[PDB]
Design a protein around this ligand. Structure first.
Ligand SMILES: COC(=O)[C@H]1[C@H]2C[C@@H]3c4[nH]c5cc(OC)ccc5c4CCN3C[C@H]2C[C@@H](OC(=O)c2cc(OC)c(OC)c(OC)c2)[C@@H]1OC
Length: 391
């Protein structure tokens, strides 16, 4: 039943990102409508920034605890717990309306995300035996992480606009319940205990300056989109008075470009130079983030989002193998390590992006927020030169 576990983990990760991102086009607009119907927007910026960063904050906080828990008790129980609490979070998103319950839903979704991510990928890694097959199947589930983040925004936005706020979350609860049911019913026979081969702890592993540089580059490149995601709908609603179904169609190009850039540069990086590809990715994401605020129409927004997605797809494809090579070279390696580092990096971005950027959006505004983050990416691009390994 190796394939079935792969399907379960793929669906878990896809639903996780879909729930993570469907919040982007409907909930900031929901709070805007519920409070206005501007100092109102000034307070709402920081409120929604904290609401969006709570998921990553709680996930980063609870990741080591859940890792210890799955080491002690096994993989399947954390996976099922993650499915159950993700379904709870989806339902509470669907029905609750006040900001406190939305915050609780976001925190519960973060805990469930940590559960599903770490327990699933670990169990998926342990079930398979062939190294090539392991790499291929992890490439499938990690690709699902991206397919979910792609399909989520437009679907959530359009259904919210047409039917209502309760329907997309109801559908998400339906899929999450189906995945939990299939895992519980047709994947009974045995429990998988994680491997006894433990790599370097994340403390010293992140203490490495080179791994720190790569993780910081990933963190900033994704913090770009992490600051885009909770403030771009508000910027559109206060600038172009766009319909509520376009708030997902505008984020569609970023994810499509991420897919395209990943597929292209996962083959082009080892020939164009991984460090050079990462540096160009940082530069391009900086330029695109600068170009985003100067758009008057969504037609003028499809291009900068395309550049943003293309750059991240390039940075990720140029750093994941770089992270693996650095870990294998300067430390002892277990297949989880790389992912773990990336996870922390991602968390950091989404723990500092919306929480702080929104405050900036309240103090200096949105265009300036984007100018600062783009300049940060541009000036961090030269730091990728310290990835000049001889091969
Ligand atoms: C919280 O996370 C995410 O939201 C996912 C995305 C992060 C970011 C993003 N967000 C958006 C949100 C939008 O609307 C709001 C619109 C566009 C985007 C884009 C384009 C840029 N990018 C796309 C998504 C990337 C996903 O992560 C991986 O794909 C991945 C792949 C791996 O191997 C192939 C890994 O192993 C090393 C790995 O380790 C952790 C992670 C990441 O999941 C962690």
């Amino acid at each position: 039943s190796r394939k079935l576990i792969l399907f379960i983990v793929f669906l878990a990760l896809l639903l996780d990102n879909m729930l993570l991102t469907v919040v982007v086009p409907i909930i900031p607009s929901y709070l805007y409508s519920i409070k206005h119907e501007d100092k109102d927007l000034l307070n709402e910026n920081v409120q929604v920034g904290l609401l969006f960063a709570s998921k990553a904050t709680v996930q980063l906080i609870t990741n080591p605890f859940i890792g210890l828990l799955t080491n002690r008790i096994g993989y399947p129980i954390p996976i099922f717990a993650g499915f159950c609490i993700m379904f709870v979070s989806t339902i509470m998103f669907a029905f609750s309306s006040s900001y406190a319950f939305l915050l609780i839903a976001r925190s519960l979704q973060g805990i469930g995300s940590s559960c599903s991510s770490v327990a699933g990928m670990g169990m998926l890694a342990s079930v398979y035996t062939d190294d090539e097959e392991r790499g291929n199947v992890m490439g499938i589930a990690l690709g699902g992480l991206a397919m979910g983040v792609l399909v989520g925004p437009p679907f959530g936005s359009v259904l919210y606009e047409f039917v209502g706020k309760t329907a997309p979350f109801l559908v998400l609860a339906a899929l999450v319940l189906l995945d939990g049911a299939i895992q519980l019913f047709v994947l009974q026979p045995s429990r998988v205990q994680p491997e006894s081969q433990k790599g370097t702890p994340l403390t010293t592993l992140l203490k490495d300056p080179y791994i720190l540089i790569a993780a910081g580059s990933i963190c900033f490149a994704n913090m770009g989109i992490a600051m885009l995601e909770p403030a771009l709908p508000i910027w559109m609603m206060e600038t172009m008075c766009s319909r509520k179904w376009q708030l997902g169609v505008a984020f569609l190009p970023a994810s499509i470009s991420y897919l395209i850039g990943t597929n292209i540069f996962g083959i082009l990086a080892h020939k164009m130079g991984r460090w050079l590809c990462a540096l160009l990715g940082m530069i391009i994401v900086g330029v695109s983030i600068l170009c985003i605020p100067f758009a008057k129409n969504i037609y003028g927004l499809i291009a900068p989002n395309f550049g943003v997605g293309f750059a991240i797809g390039m940075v990720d494809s140029s750093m994941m193998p770089i992270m693996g090579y650095l870990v294998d070279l300067r430390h002892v390696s277990v297949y989880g390590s790389v992912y773990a580092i990336a996870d922390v990096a991602f968390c950091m971005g989404y723990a500092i992006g919306p929480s702080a950027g929104g405050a900036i959006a309240k103090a200096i505004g949105f265009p300036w927020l984007m100018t600062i983050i783009g300049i940060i990416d541009i000036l961090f691009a030269p730091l990728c030169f310290f990835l000049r390994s001889p091969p």
